[PDB]
Design a protein around this ligand. Structure first.
Ligand SMILES: NC(=O)c1ccc[n+]([C@@H]2O[C@H](COP(=O)([O-])OP(=O)(O)OC[C@H]3O[C@@H](n4cnc5c(N)ncnc54)[C@H](OP(=O)(O)O)[C@@H]3O)[C@@H](O)[C@H]2O)c1
Ligand SMILES: NC(=O)[C@@H]1C[C@]2(NC(=O)NC2=O)c2cc(F)ccc2O1
Ligand SMILES: [Cl-]
Length: 316
């Protein structure tokens, strides 16, 4: 299995990256240093994660150390919902660049299709509870993203949590200058995403699978929720291949032509999660894992279900 996938901007993207949502600021610098030392070349970041400065300390140390060259890293970040405003997009990108200690991003994503009222709060609320939207058309946010490419701040632009009608709207944008390179979406055996993945791939958009292990550290986890890592059917496939359940869960999206971004702050697991290029799941294994689909979502942005652009009312 090749390590990189070709994007529609002509650049190559590592199919395995390190996730950083929930990685504590006092742990993520070591996590990213270890990741780069054991082979990771792709880090998935976001301003809303509140840890980009600490991720950046690690990246900069490894560049200064000459453990890696900048051209060999693939750093991804995302535009938060409170920065949809065309006049805030550049400053949001530049703050992320400054925090990450970078002069460009390899990929910058619109984090969600939903724009929120700008301000200090990431989830600005009305007195009665709901997300206060912004009025900025997401085609206009896309144009602002295109300007970042034309200014040299980012090499590629893309989207995240867009449903197929929303992807289509971008593809059909009057005057579209750059297609999205990537759509980053939740994907794992309980949310297999066949319909949306086929759509994106037919349009030459690469899909990145987030929460591939089912996000056991998500802050709203409950006892009775289904657990990928503990599912005896998945552990059986792992046992047959002499791999861990996490390794099967990471290899699965790789064999669907997806990029995958498991998160860990545990050095042994970071190294574990990378040793997935030495085995193959059979077609029968792949179809069996696909059969576990339950339409079960980790990340449903539940405060935003009446936003006009909430993505998950549509089938796909
Ligand atoms: N675009 C979006 O809206 C969006 C949404 C969600 C996620 N993401 C991205 O996708 C990344 C991954 O998703 P996620 O963080 O939700 O969850 P995940 O990667 O599915 O699961 C992370 C959890 O699995 C544990 N873990 C990692 N490797 C393990 C292993 N080998 N064995 C057992 N447990 C293991 C981690 O523990 P330790 O860390 O304690 O080792 C952590 O609790 C995020 O960090 C973020 O970068 C993006
Ligand atoms: N509730 C949700 O679905 C999202 C998920 C999400 N995780 C992620 O990586 N992207 C997200 O937007 C997240 C991250 C945060 F830092 C804060 C909130 C939050 O909520
Ligand atoms: Cl963000």
């Amino acid at each position: 299995m090749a390590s990189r996938i070709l994007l529609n901007n002509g650049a190559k993207m590592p199919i395995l990256g390190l996730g950083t949502w929930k990685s504590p600021p006092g742990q993520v610098t070591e996590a990213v240093k270890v990741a780069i030392d054991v082979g990771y070349r792709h880090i998935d970041c976001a301003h809303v994660y509140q840890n980009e400065n600490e991720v950046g300390v690690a990246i900069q140390e490894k560049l200064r150390e000459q453990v890696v060259k900048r051209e060999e890293l693939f750093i991804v970040s995302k535009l938060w919902c409170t920065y949809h405003e065309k006049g805030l997009v550049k400053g949001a990108c530049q703050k992320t660049l400054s925090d990450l200690k970078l002069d460009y991003l390899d990929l910058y994503l619109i984090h969600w299709p939903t724009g929120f009222k700008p301000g200090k709060e990431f989830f600005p609320l009305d007195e009665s509870g709901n997300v206060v939207p912004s009025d900025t058309n997401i085609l206009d946010t896309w144009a602002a993203m295109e300007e970042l490419v034309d200014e040299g701040l980012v090499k590629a632009i893309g989207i995240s949590n867009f449903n197929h009608l929303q992807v289509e709207m971008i593809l059909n944008k009057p005057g579209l200058k750059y297609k999205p390179a990537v759509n980053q979406i939740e994907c794992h055996p309980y949310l297999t995403q066949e319909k949306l993945i086929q759509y994106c791939q037919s349009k030459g958009i690469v899909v990145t699978a987030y929460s591939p292990l089912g996000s056991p550290d998500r802050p709203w986890a409950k006892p009775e929720d289904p657990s990928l890592l503990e599912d005896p059917r998945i552990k059986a496939i792992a046992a047959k291949h002499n791999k861990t359940t996490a390794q099967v869960l990471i290899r699965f999206p790789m064999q669907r032509n997806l990029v995958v971004i498991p998160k860990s702050v545990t050095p042994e697991r970071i190294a574990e999660n990378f040793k997935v290029f030495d085995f193959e799941l059979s077609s029968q294994d792949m179809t069996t894992l696909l059969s576990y689909n339950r339409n079960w979502r980790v990340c449903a942005l539940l405060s935003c279900t009446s936003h006009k652009d909430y993505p998950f009312h549509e089938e796909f």
